[model samples]
Target chain A: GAEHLLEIFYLLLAAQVCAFIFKRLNQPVVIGEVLAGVLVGPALLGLVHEGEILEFLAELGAVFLLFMVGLETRLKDILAVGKEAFLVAVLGVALPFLGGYLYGLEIGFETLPALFLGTALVATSVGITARVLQELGVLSRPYSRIILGAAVIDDVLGLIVLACVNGVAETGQVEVGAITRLIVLSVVFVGLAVFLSTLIARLPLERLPVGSPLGFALALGVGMAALAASIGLAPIVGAFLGGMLLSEVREKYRLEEPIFAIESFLAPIFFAMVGVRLELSALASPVVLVAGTVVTVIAILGKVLGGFLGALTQGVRSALTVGCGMAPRGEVGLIVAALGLKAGAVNEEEYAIVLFMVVFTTLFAPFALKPLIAWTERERAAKE
Target chain B: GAEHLLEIFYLLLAAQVCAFIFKRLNQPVVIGEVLAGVLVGPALLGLVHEGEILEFLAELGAVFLLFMVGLETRLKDILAVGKEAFLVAVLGVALPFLGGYLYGLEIGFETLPALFLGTALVATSVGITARVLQELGVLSRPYSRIILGAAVIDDVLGLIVLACVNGVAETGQVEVGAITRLIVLSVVFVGLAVFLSTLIARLPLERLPVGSPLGFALALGVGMAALAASIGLAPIVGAFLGGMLLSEVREKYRLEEPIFAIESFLAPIFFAMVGVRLELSALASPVVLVAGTVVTVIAILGKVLGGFLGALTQGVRSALTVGCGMAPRGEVGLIVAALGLKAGAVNEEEYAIVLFMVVFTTLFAPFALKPLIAWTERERAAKE
Candidate 1:
């Protein structure tokens, strides 16, 4: 028990120190936080081991991260970029998945293995990009709006694709009946969640047992996260929507202390654990190294190209930056690799290659994102 | 991510509903929170199970609970009752151990088993009584001060007694040299912790990377907690001292939103999980039932008698309330039970008796303390 508490302290301590160092380096503190995890985790000093407790905390860190993001966002702003976000999400998923699929087949992999590679490349871990944009203080920008909205749309799409992959892996065929039911239920869950939030937010919050607006808001957020999970959506998705539902409540209450207090303490642990889970050991073999590099290159280009074409209605540079914003796979690709291995869709060497893609793309994202965010903001300034 | 978040949601949800019901019943919400854990836990609904994640959160809830307690307390007030606290703590440990020890012998238990029972009965779970006092909103009262101070002292003394028991169990004799070192080190640790907090509190917190006072204060609290545990003390002990260190800082800053926000959400989960961990089946056999009843009776009278006598310098009612205030063994005695079992000093039936003492004393303390507090407060009014 003491050891567990000690590990939590290490994660938090590393995050604070690394966050300060990264800010000094003119990089986002999120990057430093991820580095801190590597420093304390199995990948480096081995001071912290991956365990049930840390994993739960890491997941919580992300849920609260998106909740914080949702607090800063509004439904109206998200809706304004709805068409571009949809286009961006579709293109973002398509190019990389197709790229990985062909590469897998070209390398003499079986169809299921190839499918796993493609499936792994499909979703963006919006948490990575979300924290990055939050650090840049540009979450309300037009391109950020596109990135945020598209990432959410991308998650729902990714869920559908994953179910198909699982069905094929287990039973040798896609189950359309199950797939159709899932899609409808997923949509209904989101709609019902939003509808309920609207009612609860307007109701007499003071009469509730939770009393304070923040307390009630936090309670609803956790409940919604669970509600979303019951219907097979990411818990963070529900958390984000929950936070969005309370944006007005936050404003009307004129209280702003607690959520930020919590976010600062929690969100960094999430980013750092992402780094901790990375395995540089996977790139050991020459053949594996070459394969991983090729896969990673495709992984980056696929999302960037898709994002670019999806937002083509915007100016070329603006759309290109938006595409770059969606490039990191982070926690999302890590999930696919584990799932693929478990379902026998991918083998040892293949799983290693998928891990490689997750590491590089996740690392590549923050560097790719920073210069472009500055460049795009300059564009906005120059236009003005 | 979804499963873990789902579990957390269940915990928080149960805590909220239970807290409301308990409040409606004219009882403290903490009791309801504990009952919530039982209903959802393996003992009942089986909706939640004990796991690494929940344990970590539960411990954190206790740490935060003590920190809240310290925030409401002042060093001067504690110091004023220092002499009485020492007396109360010493007597509290003495009567219980002597009673439990003789009972063990009467029941034909081995010497070590008797020693384990005595050791287990010696410490008060301050967290249970602390939360109860907090619930009553009378922490500033004189008897409450003595209870908090003595409970902390009791933990330190319990540590010494436990070490002696462990040594005897392992090597067949007491190690007085090691015991002396432990006593010296434990006192030095407490002194050093206060010294560091005084220095850090006076330092410019803005110079820290965790710039906000709350964030920096929180970081220090966790670090101090880890520091405390690095030595052999309970982490909650460190957390309480840490919170005391920040009382002046908290008031000067006058920012009160976040800690309370966090406490409401987190503390209830801790209390509920305590209820979840209890096993009523331990009292099944007629022998175990009769034995447990006798052991529990001794557990109550021993502490109450000790506290009442030690605090006789105060008025009779005041001293009696203080003794009753310290009667709950809470999380403290449970440790002794596990240690006894692990060391092979106590048999299953003996262990069950120890557990029964823990349960009855824990449940009994809350009910016993409230009426006495009200009675004492009425005495205070009449005297005036």
Candidate 2:
């Protein structure tokens, strides 16, 4: 007991110091946290002894991560942007998947390896782009909305492809029947979850007592997510659906207000834990590290180019603005890459490659896009 | 990955089912969570392979539990009731410790065993008692304030005795040096924390450019608590001081509002994890279980009688009103017991006994106190 307590303090302190540095560098604190983990992981400090409690907290962190993402999602808002969003989302997924897959194939990697690379490539981070727009005070502008809408669609699509790639990786072959069934099940799960959640939330949950309503809803959502996972669906998909459904209910809304404090404290632990799990050994390997850097560049260029091409039909300036806006690969990339690593779809080297890609794009996107976005806005105003 | 994920869902679902039943019975949902953990533990279904992640999550749960307690603590309000509170707190600690210790001695347990039993008794379950008052709507009553005040004081006193008792158990002999150090450090740390927090919060913190100032303070408070735990002090002490400091600060008062949501959501996880750690097997032994039942009864009556005698000095109605008012045991008791278990100061059996008292008093207090407080109110009106 004494030993564990001391260990947690050391881990917490390390994560804090790294996070502080990352924050000051204008980077996602998760980067420093993960670096801290890698330093203390089996490959380095080995401070965190492998045990059930640590894993559970890590998973809980993941749950809160997805839960927050669901809170931020607005499907109706995405749909409001219509065809422009659709085009960008579809093309954004396609180019990256094909680009990464072909590159893997050229290097004589097997089909599963190539598919894993493709799946990792498909994620388009919505939060970073939206944050940029929000910072620029043009988040609500029609074009900005289109970029955000597209990014969401791209993210979901990427996740779906990721699941399929995982299925293929698990079986060592992707049969049409199995792949089709998986896809159908995922869509149906999301749809059914949204529908059932709306129904129950509108019915029995409306009049539930205030004192412990969050406990009930949280329990229910977690239960359903568990069931979904048992049925061969991603637990996060269930969590996402549960979050969306709960958001519509008044009790869920009431519960939402009180849950933020708990989330803030626990979620950081989760995020920092994720950072702690990073393997420094993988990063230290010259071949893998160089590969990671290369993939990072490819991932960024692919998204920016795809976005620009998708938006070009609107106007050159609009395309450039949208492309720059869509460039950042943040949380979604991390989520996808983590999933890939856990499922063994990617080896340590491959996981490191994706991890590097996620970090690089997240770091650079803000700097590169900020000036481009400002120039676009100024030029657009001048033309008008 | 899919299998492990599914197992998590299953455990979560079982917890929800347990919660539903607890709600139906008007029992605290925390019991259900504990039951859920027991089911998943080695003694039952054995679904989870005990690991570090779960252990870490459990520890986080404990930390968050302390953090919430600290946040809710109102030092000024606790002290306002004054001398009666002080007496009740002292007597409450003395009675339970002596009673448990004597009972252990009579049963032929070793001196260390007897002291561990006494140590377990040193926790004041103010949470259960407060909940009872809140449920009865007498929490705001003048008479109830004394009970509330005493209950809060009892918690602090209980914690000090607990540390000393546990300190004795760990060292295999009475260590006055350690006992005196703990007591002195606790006061010094709390004072310094509160003073520094108030000074900083009133000046630089209030002037900081953060979007949500309250969130920052909340984070700062919890961080301080964690830091305290790292330095061999109780985290709750830091949290309490942090809250007191925040209460004294003069800021927009707007920034503090955002912290509520986060607190609410995370608190249940802490509570639920507490339930998960409960050793059901310890409660299964008829001899220990009966002893636990007896302890529960004594635990309630002792607090009530001490509070009543103290209040009699004030007035007859105040005596009955305050006596019944302090009847419930709540979160503070659970925290102390949990701390004891974590610290290895008490066996699972002793921990179970204390926990049983906490939950039982919490469940029963609302029903008994509601009518008694009403009677006191009526008697006061008649005299007038």
Candidate 3:
């Protein structure tokens, strides 16, 4: 128990130092925290062991991160860009799946492995991009809103792809009925979560004690996340919708202050976990390295082109910003890779390639977005 | 993962309902939360499982509780009562040990088991009393401050006694050197924590970000708790000292707001866990029931008499209030019981008796303090 507590202490201390250094370097503090995780994790000195507690903390980090993002967003803001977000999401999923599948085929993979790779490439990790936008103070921008909306849609599409792939792999044939049911279930879950939350928001929660509202809000977030996972969607999707639902009561609740307090401590753990999960030894094989490089390039290009084409009406700079924002596959990609490995659809080498692409995209997107975002901000300021 | 998230949701939701009801009942909210734990835990509906994550949450609850108490206290106030607090601590510990040891021997227990029972009776759980005082808005009162100071001293004294008992039990002989080393190490750790924290307080932390001070404060608290545990003291002792140390910078940091946010959510988990760990079936035997009743009465009276006599200079009313405050054995008693169980110094029946005493005192002390504290407050008002 003492050792576990000490490990946590070390993590927080490392995160603090790394974040401070990253802040001074004009980089995202999350990158530094993640790097710190790698430094202490099994990949490096191995000073900190990744245990169930750390895993729980990391999950909480994502939950709180998305919840905060939801608190900052309005439903109408997302709804206004709904059509563009849908188009972006469709193209984002299509281009990535097409590229990964074709690449897998070119490299002489079977149909199932190719399909698995494509499925892995489908979902965008909104949590990573959301944090970067938040750090850059651009979360309210039209482009950021589009990224968030598109990401939610992207998650739904990605879930369908995973279900279809798993179905085909297991039964040696596509099961339209199963895929359709999964799609309908996901849509209904999201719709119901939103509707119920809005209805609850209208209630007189003001009568609750000083801290009760915040507690209730957090409970709702966790409940929604659990609900989403129950229906085969990522928990962050539920957390995001939970936050969006609670946004209606923002004026009455004053929850941001407390939510932010908890989020600030926890979100770093999420980023650090990403770094900790990376295995540097995966790069030892030339074939894996070359394949990883190609996959990373395609992953970035596919999302940028898709997001850019869909958000073209927002003007070149804004669409480009959205494109960069959508480029990171992060944790979603890793989850897909793990699923492929578990299903025996991909060997260790193939799995490592996917992990490499995930890590590369996660690290690359924020750095690439900095200058692009700066350019967009400059253009908007000049126009204003 | 989904189930785990749902379990957390249930806990927070149950805690919310219980706390609200408790507030209405004019009782401590923690007691309500504990009862809620009993309602949902294996003892009742079996809706929530006691897992590692929940255990960690419970520990954090205790840490944050003590930290908040520290935030409310000032070093000078505690120091002002230092002499009286020490006397109270020594007597409070002595009488309980004497009573418990004699009771254990009279019940035909060996020396080690009797000593284990006595040690279990020694430490006062400040968390329970602190929360009750905080709820009643009497934490800053003179009697309350005396209780806080005495409790800290009581913890240190209790640690030394535990070390001595363990040494004797393990080797069949008292090891003065080992006991001395343990005591010296504990004192040195606490002294250094206070010294370093005060020294750091003098430096300029204002240049840091708005939330950095709070983060740093929490890191320090966790670090200290880990350190204390490593040196064979309760983590709460370190957490209390950590907060006391940071109190020097409280004016500049304004940590109360954010710390309160986290503390609110976590402290309830700690109280609830107490209820979750209870094994009511152990009290099935009528003999165990009568013995439990006898020990509970002795445990309460011993602490009350000792604390009252030690604080006699403050007048009977104030002294009585202090005595009542020190009466809850709470977590410290549980830890001792667990240790005794592990060491084979006490069997299941004896352990159950200690557990019953701990739970009874924990639940009873808050209600007992209500009337006595009210009477003291009224008496003081009349005197003024």
**lDDT tens digits, residues A1-384, model 1?**
778778878888777878777877888677888998999999778878877778777777777777877888877888888899999999888889899999999999898789788878888877888888888888888888899888878878878887776677667688888788878988887667557656745685666774245656667788777777776677788888887887766767643456766676677778878777877685357777898899989988998898788887877776887888888875556667777777787888887887777777878888888888888788878999
Q: What's the residue-level lDDT of B292 in candidate 3?
A: 88
What is the per-residue lDDT of model 2 for residues A1-384, given as tens digits with 9 covering 90 to 100?
335555555455566567566666766455565566666656577776554555455555545544544444454554566577778778777877788888888867787677678768777654445445544566545557568657545645765665565555456554567557666765676567656755754576435532355655565556555655655554554655565566555343465544443444444455455545543455357777777776776777677777677776656666766766666565445555665666565677777777777656755665666666677777778989
Q: Score the docking of each candidate (DockQ).
A: 0.46, 0.26, 0.53
Using DockQ as the measure, the top candidate is: 3
lDDT by residue for model 3 (B214-313), tens: 7678777888888888887778778888888887777777787777777876787788777777777654677778898899999999989977998888
- In terms of lDDT, the poorest run of 10 residues in model 1 chain A is A210-219
The whole-model lDDT of each prediction reads 0.79, 0.58, 0.82
Candidate 2 global CA lDDT score: 0.58
Error of 2 at A240 (Å): 5.4
Residue A358 lDDT in candidate 3: 83
Per-residue alpha-carbon lDDT of candidate 3 for residues A1-384, written as tens digits (9 for 90 to 100): 677777777777777778877887888777888887888788777868778888887888898898888888888899899988998999998898899999999999998788788778878887788888888888889999999999888888878877766665567567899889888998898778657866765667767642388878887888888888877788888888888888877667788778777777778778877777777766468888899899989888899989899999999999988988888886567666776776678887888888888888889888888888899999999999
C-alpha TM-score for every candidate: 0.92, 0.74, 0.95
The true-versus-predicted C-alpha distance at residue A288 of model 1, in Å, is: 4.6
